[PDB]
């Protein structure tokens, strides 16, 4: 029930909502989570994605190519899609596998890559990215940061 996020994971989800609204959509799917991860800018996910050349403008262009622009209709409820909810479940699994009870930005990214199917996955493929390498680089960075 969404009680297991850190502040920075909530910040990524807020940015995913804003990315939905920017294109006139009123849902958060895997692809909006991807855009929020890239654009958040400060967390582990953002700093891995940037290192790997995954650029927000490029990702936005690919997202729009696949889903287009919506009605611009805004509703206060902005629910997650089923695949996004699956990503959130997988993100909690990844957090616990890494010794955390709460989901941070890296866990959202790891969960996104594990779901592996859906608009975000297609965007990453279209950008030339390799999800297995992204995973490896996330876990590398988490380990490097252990003394803090």
Residue numbers in the entry: 94 to 241
Sentences copied from the publication:
In this context, the plant caseinolytic protease (Clp) complex plays an important role in degradation of accumulated and misfolded proteins in chloroplasts wherein the chaperones aid in ATP-dependent unfolding of protein substrates to be degraded by the associated protease machinery. The structured, mature forms of AtClpC1/C2/D consist of three distinct domains such as a short N-terminal domain (NTD) and two ATPase domains, a feature very similar to bacterial ClpC proteins. The N-terminal domain of ClpC1 is known to perform the regulatory function of substrate recognition, either directly or indirectly through the adaptor proteins ClpS1/ClpF for which it becomes a binding platform161718, whereas no adaptor proteins have so far been reported for ClpD. Here we report and analyse the crystal structures of AtClpC1 residues 94 to 238 and AtClpD residues 79 to 233 (hereafter mentioned as AtClpC1 NTD and AtClpD NTD respectively) that correspond to the ClpC NTD of eubacteria.
The 1.20 Å structure showed AtClpC1 N-terminal domain (residues 94–238) to be a α-helical domain, having 66% helical content and made up of eight tightly packed α-helices: α1 (E100-L116), α2 (T123-E133), α3 (I137-M145), α4 (L149-I160), α5 (P175-L191), α6 (S198-E208), α7 (V212-L220) and α8 (P224-N238). The two central helices: α2 and α6 which are rich in the hydrophobic residues Leu and Ile contribute significantly to the packing. The fold of AtClpC1 NTD contains two repeats of a 4-helix motif that share 46% sequence identity and 84.1% similarity in a region of 63-residue overlap. A 14-residue long loop between α4 and α5 connects the two repeats. The two halves that stay in close proximity are related by a pseudo two-fold axis of symmetry. Strong sequence identity and conservation of secondary structure between the two halves suggest the possibility of an early evolutionary gene duplication event that could have resulted in this repeated motif, as has been predicted for the N-terminal domain of bacterial ClpA and other ClpC proteins. A query to the DALI database and PDBeFold server with AtClpC1 NTD structure coordinates yielded NTD of mycobacterial ClpC1 and other Gram-positive bacterial ClpC as the most similar structures. A comparison of the crystal structures of MtClpC1-CymA complex and AtClpC1 shows the CymA-interacting residues to be conserved. Phe95, Phe173, Lys178 and Glu182 of AtClpC1 occupy the same position as the residues involved in MtClpC1 NTD interaction with CymA. So we presume CymA would bind readily to AtClpC1 NTD as well.
